[model samples]
Target: SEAVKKWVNKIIEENIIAVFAKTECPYCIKAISILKGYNLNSHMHVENIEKNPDMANIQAYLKELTGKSSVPRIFINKDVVGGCDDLVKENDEGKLKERLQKLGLVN
Candidate 1:
C-alpha cells in the first residue's frame, strides 16, 4: 500500500502531464487523443495502470487522491483535470491549450 502510494506521488510529481488510464477504456483514449493534439512531443506521461499487478490497489489509491474511482484520471501540471468530458470541455473552451502553453508543453 505504501509502495503504491509512493509510486503514485512519484509519477504525479515527476511528470508535467500524467494520465492514469487503461488501454481499452474509451474515455481514456479520448483524453489521450485530446492531449496528443497538443505539441507536447514526448513530454507526456501515461500509465496503463491496469497492467500493474497492483492495479486494484493503485486505482483504490487514486480514488482517495482524486475524488473518484474512475479511469482516465488526467493530471496537468500535477493538477487533476477530471475525466474525458472534462478534458474535452476544457479543450473546447481553449483553456486546455492555455494551460499547456503556460507550462511550455506547447508552442
Candidate 2:
C-alpha cells in the first residue's frame, strides 16, 4: 500500500503538471478548465485524494514535498505553483504559457 502511494506520487512528480483536489471542489473544476483550455489534457493528472482513503497519504506526502496543506495544489515538475488563484493569475498574465513553452508544450 505504501508502495502504491509512492508510485502515484512519483507519477505526479514526473508529470509536467499535476492537480490534487477533491471532485466536489469548484477550484478543482476551474483548474481542470484551465488545463483543458491550454489543450494540456495528457500532461495533467487529477488525483481526488478525498475519495480514496489510500490517497490520504498523498496529502501528507504533499506537505512533506511542498511544506503546505493547501488543497487543489498544483505542481509543475515537482515545483509548487500554488493553488487555484495562483493558477488563474498565471494564466491571465501569460506566465503560464511561458512555463509551458519551457516544458516544450508550445513554441
Candidate 3:
C-alpha cells in the first residue's frame, strides 16, 4: 500500500512543479502567494518534514535535488529551482515566464 501510494504520487507529479514547505513559514506563504498572484497554475506539494517522518525522505530528496536544505524549496517541470527569493528573482528577471512558456503555459 505504501509503495502504491508513493508510485501514484510520483506519477501524478511527473509534469508538475513540486513545492516543499511548512504551512506556517512566512517565506513559504509568500512564495505560494506570489505564484498565485501571477495566476500561474501549479501543482504544489506542501510537506511538514519536522512533523512527519514520511516527509524526511522528501526533504532529503529535495536537498539532493537543490544542493541545499531550505524550506519553500521549489521544482519547476521537475527541475529544482530553489526557494522564495529564487522564485521571485526568476519571475522578476522574466526567466520564469520563459520557463512557463516552455511548459506550454504561454506563447
Worst 10 residues of 2 by lDDT: 1-10
TM-score-better candidate, 1 vs 2: 1
Clashing pairs in model 1, backbone N/Cα/C closer than 3 A = none
Candidate 3 lDDT tens digits, 2-77: 6534742573376466667875899988887877665565554555555665555666656666887778887777
- lDDT per residue, candidate 1, 5-101, as tens digits? 9999888889888899986999998788778878564778889998989989988988888888789998888888888888889999998988988
For all predictions, the C-alpha RMSD in Å is 1.2, 2.1, 3.5
Per model, how many backbone clashes are there?
Answer: 0, 0, 0
Residue 59 lDDT (model 2): 73
lDDT by residue (56-106, candidate 2, tens digit) is 677777777777666788888777887889989998999889888899877
Task: Name the better of 2 and 3 by TM-score.
Answer: 2
Segments of candidate 2 deviating more than 4 angstroms: 1-5
- Which sequence of candidate numbers ranks them by lDDT, best first? 1, 2, 3
Which segments of candidate 1 are over 4 A away from where they belong? none
